[PDB]
RNA sequence: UUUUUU
């Protein structure tokens, strides 16, 4: 199943490409998702990345939590619920 | 096969019976479906109901959109796409 | 601020 990473504070413009670019360097990434409103196709402000190996995921989170992405401070953590 | 109604914000637990119960009072209902993950039958958070009369579907939509079902506010509309 | 149209 890998490990699901939740990213908060993406801009309404954000694309999957940016999630790939940020997490890719840390190890295997199997899925990225920007969450959009169905009717406007705008980003609702969050997204998800699945990484296969926990230690890689944890390194991504340690580096990216608090990143200034565009003009927002990201919150990055393992997905809850 | 009739007017397709989209219901968002069902619980993981949701069953067909809750859709029948809520939509039944409004008129003829021919089909209900809770959308579940294929390999784990957890509800994906949404479902569909098919009603045969336009005015009865409209009534159900206008009355149930915003309903507090369990601890979630439903979004109920005519299916889009 | 935790995956919204089979």
Numbering used by the authors:
A (entry chain B), B (entry chain A): 242 to 322
According to the publication:
HuR/ELAVL1 is an RNA-binding protein involved in differentiation and stress response that acts primarily by stabilizing messenger RNA (mRNA) targets.
Both RNAs were bound by RRM3, with a Kd of 156 μM and 19 μM, respectively. It thus seems plausible that the lower Kd of RRM3 binding to U6 results from both avidity due to binding in multiple registers and preference for U-rich over AUUUA motifs. We observed a substantial increase in RRM solubility after RNA binding and were thus able to use untagged RRM3 incubated with selected RNA ligands for structural studies of the complex. Interestingly, the β2β3 loop that is in close proximity to the 3′ end of the RNA in the crystal structure of the RRM3–U6 RNA complex appears to be most significantly affected by U6 titration. To summarize, the core of the RNA interactions with RRM3 is formed by three binding pockets with canonical aromatic residues from RNP2 and RNP1 (Phe247, Tyr249, Phe289) that recognize a U–U–U/A RNA sequence motif. The affected area correlates best with the dimeric interface found between chains A and B in the structures of RNA-bound RRM3 suggesting this is the dimerization interface in solution.
